[PDB]
């Protein structure tokens, strides 16, 4: 029952997550969702009156590109600087003993600020703001083994990608910044590129007294 409590700089959820509209990638209530977005916008503006939504998306793509370059060169300090504590471990622990070759080629269309949401005051005296941004870019990816053998992707071939990246800033923090919190992938998303190796999924392991049922 010590008076020192854990001082978190982020949350681990999305406040009213943007549900993906069907056919957004296939094609090359609005007033209510808009009005909620700008209610959250005047909350960010009140906590910091120097924020521009029209100026966000270039900073968002900058944060994304530099975070993935820090992922390329294993710069965990700058990755902490640009990436929230909820997004860091599911960024790094699947690549902890692997080599990742990532690059940014171009953007097909400019990124779009598509959702803005805010927290309540009660969150331990802290108020957080999240902004969801559509990105649709062309990237390259080549993840290597512990031994240097190739596992995923191709070295030179670029491919299209569409993500719903959600950034979060702690507004009450005097030194808070906009960092990547997560990314929504749609449930209707196209299936990912197949892996380069073969996988055996085992069946049930049967005790002697048990009989296999189909």
Partner 1 sequence: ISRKWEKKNKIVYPPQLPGEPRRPAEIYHCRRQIKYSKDKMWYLAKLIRGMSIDQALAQLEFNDKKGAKIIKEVLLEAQDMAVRDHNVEFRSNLYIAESTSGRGQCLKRIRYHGRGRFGIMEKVYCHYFVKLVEGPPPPPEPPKTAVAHAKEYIQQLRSRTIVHTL
Partner 2 sequence: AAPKNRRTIEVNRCRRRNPQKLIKVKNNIDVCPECGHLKQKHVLCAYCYEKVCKETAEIRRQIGKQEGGPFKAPTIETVVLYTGETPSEQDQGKRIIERDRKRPSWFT
Partner 3 sequence: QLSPTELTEMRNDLFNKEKARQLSLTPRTEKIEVKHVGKTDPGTVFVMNKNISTPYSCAMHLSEWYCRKSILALVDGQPWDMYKPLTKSCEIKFLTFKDCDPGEVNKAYWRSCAMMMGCVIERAFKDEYMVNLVRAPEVPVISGAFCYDVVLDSKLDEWMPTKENLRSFTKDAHALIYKDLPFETLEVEAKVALEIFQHSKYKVDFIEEKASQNPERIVKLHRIGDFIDVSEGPLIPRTSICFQYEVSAVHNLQPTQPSLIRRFQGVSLPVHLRAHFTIWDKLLERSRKMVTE
Query: How many other CB atoms are there within 10 angstroms of residue 70's CB atom?
Result: 20
Choose the one of partner 1, partner 2, partner 3, none that binds residue 209, judging by a C-beta under 5 to 8 angstroms depending on kind: partner 2
Report residue 98 CA to chain centroid gap: 20
Residue closest to 17 by CA, chosen among 166, 134, 126, 123: 166
Site string for partner 2, 152-191 (x = CB under 8 A): ----------------------------------------
214 touches partner 2 (CB under 8 A): no
Q: Look-up: residue for tokens 């005790």?
A: 207
- Residues with Cβ within 8 Å of 111's Cβ and at least 6 positions away in sequence, in order, are 57, 58, 60, 61, 133, 134, 135, 136
Q: Is the dihedral of CA 3, 121, 61, 87 positive or negative?
A: positive
Residue 23 or 194 having the CB closest to partner 3: 194
Choose the one of partner 1, partner 2, partner 3, none that binds residue 147, judging by a C-beta under 5 to 8 angstroms depending on kind: partner 1
212 touches partner 1 (CB under 8 A): no
Residues that bind partner 3 (CB under 8 A): 194-196, 198-204, 212, 214
Residues that bind partner 1 (CB under 8 A): 97, 99, 101, 144-151, 197-198, 200
């Amino acid at each position: 029952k010590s008076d020192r409590s854990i001082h978190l700089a982020c949350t681990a959820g999305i406040f009213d997550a943007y549900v993906p509209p069907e056919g957004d990638a296939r094609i090359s209530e609005r007033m209510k969702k808009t009005m909620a977005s700008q209610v959250s916008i005047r909350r960010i503006k009140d906590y910091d009156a120097n924020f521009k939504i029209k100026d966000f998306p270039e900073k968002a793509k900058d944060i994304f590109i530099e975070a993935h370059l820090c992922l390329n060169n294993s710069d965990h300090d700058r990755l902490h600087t640009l990436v929230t504590e909820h997004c860091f471990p599911d960024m790094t622990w699947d690549i902890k003993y692997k080599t990742v070759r990532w690059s940014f080629v171009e953007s097909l269309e400019p990124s779009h600020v598509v959702q803005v949401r805010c927290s309540s005051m009660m969150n331990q005296g802290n108020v957080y703001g999240q902004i969801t941004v559509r990105m649709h870019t062309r990237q390259t990816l080549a993840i290597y083994d512990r031994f240097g053998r190739l596992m995923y992707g191709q070295e030179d071939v670029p491919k299209d990608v569409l993500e719903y990246v959600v950034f979060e800033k702690q507004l009450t923090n005097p030194y808070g910044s906009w960092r990547m919190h997560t990314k929504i992938v749609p449930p209707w998303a196209p299936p990912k590129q197949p892996i380069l190796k073969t996988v055996m999924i085992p069946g049930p392991q049967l005790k002697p007294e048990e009989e296999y049922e189909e």
